[PDB]
Design an enzyme around this catalytic site. Sequence first.
Site, PDB file in Angstrom:
ATOM      1  N   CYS A  98       7.175  12.809  -3.443  1.00  0.00           N
ATOM      2  CA  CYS A  98       7.955  11.596  -3.622  1.00  0.00           C
ATOM      3  C   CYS A  98       8.666  11.612  -4.966  1.00  0.00           C
ATOM      4  O   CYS A  98       9.501  12.475  -5.227  1.00  0.00           O
ATOM      5  CB  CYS A  98       7.041  10.380  -3.279  1.00  0.00           C
ATOM      6  SG  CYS A  98       7.968   8.761  -3.348  1.00  0.00           S
TER       7      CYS A  98
ATOM      8  N   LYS B 150      16.078   0.815  -0.896  1.00  0.00           N
ATOM      9  CA  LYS B 150      14.812   1.531  -0.689  1.00  0.00           C
ATOM     10  C   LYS B 150      14.743   2.033   0.757  1.00  0.00           C
ATOM     11  O   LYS B 150      15.029   1.292   1.631  1.00  0.00           O
ATOM     12  CB  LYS B 150      13.604   0.641  -0.906  1.00  0.00           C
ATOM     13  CG  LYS B 150      12.315   1.455  -1.045  1.00  0.00           C
ATOM     14  CD  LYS B 150      11.207   0.588  -1.516  1.00  0.00           C
ATOM     15  CE  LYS B 150      10.282   1.257  -2.477  1.00  0.00           C
ATOM     16  NZ  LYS B 150       8.900   0.779  -2.274  1.00  0.00           N
TER      17      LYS B 150
ATOM     18  N   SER C 176       9.024   5.880   1.531  1.00  0.00           N
ATOM     19  CA  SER C 176       8.983   4.660   0.703  1.00  0.00           C
ATOM     20  C   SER C 176       9.595   5.054  -0.629  1.00  0.00           C
ATOM     21  O   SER C 176       8.862   5.414  -1.500  1.00  0.00           O
ATOM     22  CB  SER C 176       7.601   4.188   0.515  1.00  0.00           C
ATOM     23  OG  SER C 176       7.650   2.920  -0.150  1.00  0.00           O
TER      24      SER C 176
ATOM     25  N   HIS D   6       5.581  10.124   2.301  1.00  0.00           N
ATOM     26  CA  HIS D   6       4.171   9.805   1.979  1.00  0.00           C
ATOM     27  C   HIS D   6       3.309   9.937   3.222  1.00  0.00           C
ATOM     28  O   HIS D   6       2.713   8.972   3.672  1.00  0.00           O
ATOM     29  CB  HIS D   6       4.135   8.392   1.393  1.00  0.00           C
ATOM     30  CG  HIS D   6       4.503   8.296  -0.039  1.00  0.00           C
ATOM     31  ND1 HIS D   6       3.645   8.740  -1.038  1.00  0.00           N
ATOM     32  CD2 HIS D   6       5.613   7.784  -0.651  1.00  0.00           C
ATOM     33  CE1 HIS D   6       4.208   8.513  -2.232  1.00  0.00           C
ATOM     34  NE2 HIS D   6       5.420   7.890  -2.031  1.00  0.00           N
TER      35      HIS D   6
ATOM     36  N   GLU E 270       0.419  10.924   3.492  1.00  0.00           N
ATOM     37  CA  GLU E 270      -0.994  10.630   3.102  1.00  0.00           C
ATOM     38  C   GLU E 270      -1.262   9.118   3.244  1.00  0.00           C
ATOM     39  O   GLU E 270      -2.423   8.745   3.200  1.00  0.00           O
ATOM     40  CB  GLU E 270      -1.255  11.162   1.687  1.00  0.00           C
ATOM     41  CG  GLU E 270      -0.721  10.337   0.502  1.00  0.00           C
ATOM     42  CD  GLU E 270       0.813  10.362   0.251  1.00  0.00           C
ATOM     43  OE1 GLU E 270       1.532  11.062   1.033  1.00  0.00           O
ATOM     44  OE2 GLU E 270       1.248   9.725  -0.747  1.00  0.00           O
TER      45      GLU E 270
ATOM     46  N   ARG F 231       3.817  -8.008  -0.401  1.00  0.00           N
ATOM     47  CA  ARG F 231       3.938  -8.348  -1.854  1.00  0.00           C
ATOM     48  C   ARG F 231       5.422  -8.702  -2.170  1.00  0.00           C
ATOM     49  O   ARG F 231       5.712  -9.704  -2.862  1.00  0.00           O
ATOM     50  CB  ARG F 231       3.420  -7.176  -2.690  1.00  0.00           C
ATOM     51  CG  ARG F 231       3.331  -7.529  -4.169  1.00  0.00           C
TER      52      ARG F 231
END
Lengths: 291, 292
Positions: free
Chosen positions: A136, A157, A186, A229, A231, A243
Amino acid sequence: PIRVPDELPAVNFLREENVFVMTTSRAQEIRPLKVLILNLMPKKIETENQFLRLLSNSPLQVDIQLLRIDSRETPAEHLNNFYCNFEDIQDQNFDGLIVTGAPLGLVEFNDVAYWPQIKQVLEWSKDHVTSTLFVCWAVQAALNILYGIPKQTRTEKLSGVYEHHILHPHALLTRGFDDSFLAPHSRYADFPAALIRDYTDLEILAETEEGDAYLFASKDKRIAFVTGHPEYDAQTLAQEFFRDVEAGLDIDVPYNYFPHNDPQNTPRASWRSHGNLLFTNWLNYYVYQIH
Amino acid sequence: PIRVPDELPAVNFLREENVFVMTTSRAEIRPLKVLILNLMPKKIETENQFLRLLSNSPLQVDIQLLRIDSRESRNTPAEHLNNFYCNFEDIQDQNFDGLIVTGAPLGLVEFNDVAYWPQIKQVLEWSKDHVTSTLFVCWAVQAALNILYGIPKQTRTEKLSGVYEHHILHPHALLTRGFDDSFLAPHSRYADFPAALIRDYTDLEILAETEEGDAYLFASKDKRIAFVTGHPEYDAQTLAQEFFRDVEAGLDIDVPYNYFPHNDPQNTPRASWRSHGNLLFTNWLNYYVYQI
């Protein structure tokens, strides 16, 4: 690898697929691998669990050391108990290094307080680490430090579970990958494949459908890059989404993430398989090298 | 497996996910012996497809190929078999970590009519004491459920032929480690494997089913025996080659399900099941054939 009679047809057939085979007329040393993780993610334990889950899926023993980039204060107990500083390991060689992502998508490099420490680890890795995998944001850092590529940022994003394809049917890092597969992104970092092709000598192994590099590596396997990502847990994107909604950003949902695009629905880890294959392949063919 | 300090949070967290973790107590990795009883009509294709998968491991896998038939049962010598295969008497006094029994073109034959049924029984009885983990594929599943559980053969009313949707039943299982919740795998069978049959007449754990209710993967809790009812070892073109031979031979048949792009046999099929074939065979070697 399999060991079969020299003239079994499988020998020439699998060698033509870039598969190493042993034959009964010839013959290895398989010792514990040493892997270092430079954890730049703010939720240190969650990131530890996510990467160590995927580094568990090889019969090879993977001796793990955790590296902190500086001594800024995660519990201070946690870091002091389990992490080393760069001066503690600088005289050691490693089979592998992972540099995680970091929340630095919208920070110029000169504003990154530990930028000098990152340059020092990447320079050291050239001679001290058999294979380094950058994740990333670390990809953006490494493209800058190793190839002089300036930071490139997207308009919005990229957040979601995207379709990808492999470019090399017989590659090691994508061994067993389906021709098309899902992986999560992300990021604000922009990674158009053309940027990697025009400003590096790296081989591109997988792309997103929209034309971003997803997996690429050097031919000598010293450096490898993943822009997603894989993982991440099922809920990881959802936690970021909620959030941002709570802060009043009122953004779109992540792409192809929530069932029916409704955040009241439970997301599942639809990208699991190729995250497992990726880390298994990196340990088995990049960190461990039979040759 | 990873090796970390015992108190690292990952230790208890991954153990709760059924993942073996070494902790910084004392840090010699041995070659494995695997036998393949190849019953398929295309012997070399079958060897290439299973050896491709068993090759995707750092473990050294010493392979021996077993034939069920004698050298003298054949009107001419089978050159390939004579050159590469042993008979049961050659390996009867050896121990193996793994055995694979492939599928066989016996879906419409009664067990008592199968010419080499005694030889198959002899191998399965021997495997109990001589093989750490046996993987049965397709017909070999029916053979094994008969010999081990007394389950009679069952035949579907219509042949299954295509790439089908599946789901896993056990999120933290070893054999399905890394499998997506839903995934693709090929079937090509008249053998009938309803999950209810496995649940109601065996003590085997079901690890994955087709969406229509068949058992796809199941195993014993001690990992001595494992069963797969599909063909994730198939190349992209395997169903296509069979389809074109059926068309040329004069059969009036649909394309295999969910196989050719747009269901058009002019289109090149992709191995849409490759990933979970790799996970399956990699997990079988790593957690079933190799144990410690």
